[PDB]
Scaffold this active site. Structure first.
Site, PDB file in Angstrom:
ATOM      1  N   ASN A   1      41.722  52.798  31.221  1.00  0.00           N
ATOM      2  CA  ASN A   1      41.695  51.721  30.238  1.00  0.00           C
ATOM      3  C   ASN A   1      40.301  51.472  29.675  1.00  0.00           C
ATOM      4  O   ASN A   1      40.087  50.444  29.020  1.00  0.00           O
ATOM      5  CB  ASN A   1      42.237  50.424  30.851  1.00  0.00           C
ATOM      6  CG  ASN A   1      41.295  49.831  31.879  1.00  0.00           C
ATOM      7  OD1 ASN A   1      40.500  50.546  32.492  1.00  0.00           O
ATOM      8  ND2 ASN A   1      41.377  48.519  32.073  1.00  0.00           N
TER       9      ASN A   1
ATOM     10  N   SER B   1      32.695  43.864  53.731  1.00  0.00           N
ATOM     11  CA  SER B   1      33.673  43.320  52.795  1.00  0.00           C
ATOM     12  C   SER B   1      34.053  44.324  51.721  1.00  0.00           C
ATOM     13  O   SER B   1      35.083  44.149  51.065  1.00  0.00           O
ATOM     14  CB  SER B   1      33.155  42.058  52.104  1.00  0.00           C
ATOM     15  OG  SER B   1      32.060  42.346  51.252  1.00  0.00           O
TER      16      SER B   1
ATOM     17  N   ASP C   1      40.066  44.461  33.915  1.00  0.00           N
ATOM     18  CA  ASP C   1      40.503  45.530  34.803  1.00  0.00           C
ATOM     19  C   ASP C   1      41.457  45.054  35.889  1.00  0.00           C
ATOM     20  O   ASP C   1      41.909  45.875  36.694  1.00  0.00           O
ATOM     21  CB  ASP C   1      39.292  46.211  35.453  1.00  0.00           C
ATOM     22  CG  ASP C   1      39.270  47.713  35.218  1.00  0.00           C
ATOM     23  OD1 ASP C   1      40.007  48.194  34.333  1.00  0.00           O
ATOM     24  OD2 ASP C   1      38.523  48.416  35.929  1.00  0.00           O
TER      25      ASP C   1
ATOM     26  N   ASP D   1      47.148  28.517  40.964  1.00  0.00           N
ATOM     27  CA  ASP D   1      46.221  29.335  40.192  1.00  0.00           C
ATOM     28  C   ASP D   1      44.970  29.642  41.004  1.00  0.00           C
ATOM     29  O   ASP D   1      44.143  28.739  41.212  1.00  0.00           O
ATOM     30  CB  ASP D   1      45.849  28.613  38.896  1.00  0.00           C
ATOM     31  CG  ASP D   1      44.837  29.381  38.071  1.00  0.00           C
ATOM     32  OD1 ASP D   1      44.784  30.621  38.196  1.00  0.00           O
ATOM     33  OD2 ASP D   1      44.087  28.745  37.299  1.00  0.00           O
TER      34      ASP D   1
ATOM     35  N   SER E   1      35.137  44.431  59.819  1.00  0.00           N
ATOM     36  CA  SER E   1      34.693  44.271  61.200  1.00  0.00           C
ATOM     37  C   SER E   1      33.460  43.383  61.354  1.00  0.00           C
ATOM     38  O   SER E   1      33.207  42.903  62.464  1.00  0.00           O
ATOM     39  CB  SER E   1      34.424  45.644  61.829  1.00  0.00           C
ATOM     40  OG  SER E   1      33.341  46.308  61.206  1.00  0.00           O
TER      41      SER E   1
ATOM     42  N   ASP F   1      40.389  35.155  49.972  1.00  0.00           N
ATOM     43  CA  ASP F   1      38.956  35.033  49.730  1.00  0.00           C
ATOM     44  C   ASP F   1      38.638  33.778  48.919  1.00  0.00           C
ATOM     45  O   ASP F   1      39.228  32.716  49.151  1.00  0.00           O
ATOM     46  CB  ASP F   1      38.461  36.307  49.031  1.00  0.00           C
ATOM     47  CG  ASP F   1      37.003  36.614  49.322  1.00  0.00           C
ATOM     48  OD1 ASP F   1      36.123  35.870  48.845  1.00  0.00           O
ATOM     49  OD2 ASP F   1      36.739  37.598  50.045  1.00  0.00           O
TER      50      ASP F   1
ATOM     51  N   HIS G   1      33.295  36.909  45.074  1.00  0.00           N
ATOM     52  CA  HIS G   1      33.538  37.865  46.150  1.00  0.00           C
ATOM     53  C   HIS G   1      34.959  38.418  46.103  1.00  0.00           C
ATOM     54  O   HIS G   1      35.165  39.631  46.215  1.00  0.00           O
ATOM     55  CB  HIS G   1      33.249  37.191  47.493  1.00  0.00           C
ATOM     56  CG  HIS G   1      33.201  38.134  48.654  1.00  0.00           C
ATOM     57  ND1 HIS G   1      34.203  38.201  49.599  1.00  0.00           N
ATOM     58  CD2 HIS G   1      32.263  39.034  49.035  1.00  0.00           C
ATOM     59  CE1 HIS G   1      33.887  39.106  50.508  1.00  0.00           C
ATOM     60  NE2 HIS G   1      32.716  39.627  50.188  1.00  0.00           N
TER      61      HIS G   1
ATOM     62  N   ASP H   1      46.351  28.881  45.404  1.00  0.00           N
ATOM     63  CA  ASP H   1      45.074  28.200  45.616  1.00  0.00           C
ATOM     64  C   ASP H   1      45.268  27.189  46.742  1.00  0.00           C
ATOM     65  O   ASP H   1      45.747  26.073  46.516  1.00  0.00           O
ATOM     66  CB  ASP H   1      44.585  27.522  44.338  1.00  0.00           C
ATOM     67  CG  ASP H   1      43.211  26.889  44.498  1.00  0.00           C
ATOM     68  OD1 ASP H   1      42.765  26.689  45.649  1.00  0.00           O
ATOM     69  OD2 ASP H   1      42.580  26.576  43.468  1.00  0.00           O
TER      70      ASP H   1
ATOM     71  N   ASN I   1      31.391  32.422  43.735  1.00  0.00           N
ATOM     72  CA  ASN I   1      32.790  32.758  44.000  1.00  0.00           C
ATOM     73  C   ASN I   1      33.211  34.064  43.340  1.00  0.00           C
ATOM     74  O   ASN I   1      34.341  34.200  42.863  1.00  0.00           O
ATOM     75  CB  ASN I   1      33.683  31.607  43.556  1.00  0.00           C
ATOM     76  CG  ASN I   1      33.400  30.333  44.326  1.00  0.00           C
ATOM     77  OD1 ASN I   1      33.483  30.308  45.555  1.00  0.00           O
ATOM     78  ND2 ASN I   1      33.037  29.276  43.611  1.00  0.00           N
TER      79      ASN I   1
HETATM   80 CA   LIG Z   1      30.596  39.434  63.923  1.00  0.00          CA
HETATM   81 CA   LIG Z   2      39.442  50.541  34.738  1.00  0.00          CA
HETATM   82 CA   LIG Z   3      43.235  26.454  41.189  1.00  0.00          CA
END
Ligand SMILES: [Ca+2]
Ligand SMILES: [Ca+2]
Ligand SMILES: [Ca+2]
Ligand code: NA
Ligand code: NA
EC number: 3.4.21.75
Lengths: 82, 465
Positions: B99, B259, B53, B72, B184, B44, B85, B65, B83
């Site tokens: 936690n 997603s 978390d 990284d 999909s 992604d 996502h 990357d 960014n």
């Molecule tokens: Ca499509």
């Molecule tokens: Ca948690």
């Molecule tokens: Ca990087």
């Protein structure tokens, strides 16, 4: 569509052949493409980094080489997050 | 075992619910499966590896990357949080449990990584490098992205990506096969068809669709025969959404779209791998087919195939059932090696006109090493010309009578490009007997006078004997 001066090629001869191909045809060898052994990425030394036009005759020279199974010029793909 | 104590866990209705409208994940945890020893990677826009978390489960061995060529995968911070996502997807799989932070991942003891590959120029090489990263360390790859969902586009993996898929499933995981989980699509509003998306449509990807909380087909959903199963995601504004980790060390309750469905499936699949680490990539798809539940999902096209399973083009085989998945996996017998039967149907081109029907009895490669008596995937590789592509609807009927819609009308697709050996895939005849009459239907769904020709129809059958 924006074509980039990067070419991928399948080269059974391995990295030594890939290196020879780069210097002979005018590329910088960037390296193997991930875990695809014998697939390598090249950047042409003089061709522009981005263009609306494909570089057909560069591609033909690379794929026509007897050490190359196939080759393709890379281009920027439209990919969306879902 | 105690269920998670995290503050937002109660809001993760899709994990634990009082009402039986959930993914039955609690039953998997209670059996002792939390994803321990399993490695998942999100392909992604990056992963906030220091998120409170995610940090405890973050795995640099499962990350890279590709956009900036460094190890990284940290997201690029922008005013508008473009960014975020990949961090939202990573949290659904493996957000840390117990936690005091946000909620939990489905596989909250799994290791989670990220390939930063969408925040830049995406080429065939970029995709292949991401799909083939550390294929003997990463077990499961989760990808939400794909071709534009505008209802006009026909596009799939190019040659390097296609090769990375095949090397992944054949050689990854020490030969058992990388598990690619795919979303999909979100083109429902544009009447998009996910068979026109070669990533979801691929046999190598476990393609996942979405269902709203109240059990309905979301507005953004795409129907197609290649979808395998479904997990919950967003819907209308009375229906709840996905709770996960968000950029800048925050917690979101508003993750949406397909997603959000695919990472939940990747988590459930991580639990299943922990239950049986010897499952092959095809073993896993068999498990999804047998254990997925149509019951709580409302669809207008539920149909019983030839082996008695209900299947929908909106849902595949229905909602994933983690408790049934881990249970069936433990004593699962690995299936026979994959066979591939290629059958050329046409002896000459066929005019399409208003409607074309192509019938053909096949032996499924009888008397040959790739003889198939039990079907897995099936493809119709079509080559055809047409003046107005979106007016076409295409169906494939199996010998046992199962009708797969390979392509539905796409009102926005005015292309005259036709299809160039495009492989339409269906999962709906899984486990059926392949021999007998297959029927291909191609129809002009419009009143306008359209014209074209089907020049090539290759029926490709995958399965065992
Ligand atoms: Ca499509
Ligand atoms: Ca948690
Ligand atoms: Ca990087
Ligand atoms: Na050559
Ligand atoms: Na797929």
């Amino acid at each position: 569509r924006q074509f980039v001066n990067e070419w991928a090629a399948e080269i059974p001869g391995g990295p030594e052949a890939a290196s020879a191909i780069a210097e002979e045809l005018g590329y910088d060898l960037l390296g193997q493409i991930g875990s695809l052994e014998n697939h390598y990425l090249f950047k042409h030394k003089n061709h522009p980094a981005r263009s609306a036009a494909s570089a057909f005759h560069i591609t033909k020279r690379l794929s026509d080489d007897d050490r190359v199974i196939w080759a393709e010029q890379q281009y920027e793909k439209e990919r969306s997050k879902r | 075992y105690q269920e998670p104590t995290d503050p937002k866990f109660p809001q993760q209705w899709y994990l634990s619910g009082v009402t039986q409208r959930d993914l039955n994940v609690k039953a998997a945890w209670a059996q002792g499966y939390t994803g321990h020893g399993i490695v998942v990677s999100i392909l992604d826009d990056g992963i906030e590896k220091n998120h409170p978390d995610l940090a405890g489960n973050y795995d640099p061995g499962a990350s890279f990357d590709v956009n900036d060529q460094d190890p990284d995968p940290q997201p690029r911070y922008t005013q508008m949080n473009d960014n975020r996502h990949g961090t939202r997807c990573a949290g659904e799989v493996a957000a840390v449990a117990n936690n005091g932070v946000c909620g939990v991942g489905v596989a909250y003891n799994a290791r989670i990584g990220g390939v930063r590959m969408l925040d830049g120029e995406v080429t065939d090489a970029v995709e292949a490098r991401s799909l083939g990263l550390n294929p003997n360390h990463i077990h499961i790859y989760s990808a939400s992205w794909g071709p534009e969902d505008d209802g006009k586009t026909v596009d799939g993996p190019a040659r390097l990506a296609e090769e990375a898929f095949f090397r992944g499933v054949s050689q990854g995981r020490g030969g058992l096969g990388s598990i690619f989980v795919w979303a999909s699509g979100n083109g429902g509003r544009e009447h998009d068809s996910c068979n026109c998306d070669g990533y979801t449509n691929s046999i190598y990807t476990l393609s996942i669709s979405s269902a709203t909380q109240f059990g309905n087909v979301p507005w953004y959903s795409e129907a197609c025969s290649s979808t395998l199963a479904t997990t919950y995601s967003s819907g209308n504004q009375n229906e709840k959404q996905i709770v996960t980790t968000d950029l800048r060390q925050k917690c979101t309750e508003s993750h949406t779209g397909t997603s959000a469905s695919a990472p939940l499936a990747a988590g459930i699949i991580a639990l299943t791998l922990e239950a049986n680490k010897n499952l092959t990539w095809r073993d896993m798809q068999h498990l999804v087919v047998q254990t997925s539940k149509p019951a709580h999902l409302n669809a207008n096209d539920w149909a019983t195939n030839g082996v008695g399973r209900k299947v929908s083009h909106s849902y595949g085989y229905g909602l994933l059932d983690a408790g049934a998945m881990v249970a069936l996996a433990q004593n699962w017998t690995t299936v026979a090696p994959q066979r591939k039967c290629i059958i050329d149907i046409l002896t000459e081109p066929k005019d399409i006109g208003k409607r074309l029907e192509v019938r053909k009895t096949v032996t499924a490669c009888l008397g040959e090493p790739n003889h198939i008596t039990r079907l897995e995937h099936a493809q119709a590789r079509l080559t055809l010309s047409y003046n107005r592509r979106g007016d076409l609807a295409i169906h494939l009927v199996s010998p046992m009578g199962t009708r797969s819609t390979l392509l539905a009308a796409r009102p926005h697709d005015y292309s005259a490009d036709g299809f160039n050996d495009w492989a339409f895939m269906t999962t709906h005849s899984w486990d059926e007997d392949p021999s007998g009459e297959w029927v291909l239907e191609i129809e002009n769904t419009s009143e306008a006078n359209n014209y074209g020709t089907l020049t090539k129809f290759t029926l490709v059958l995958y399965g065992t004997a």
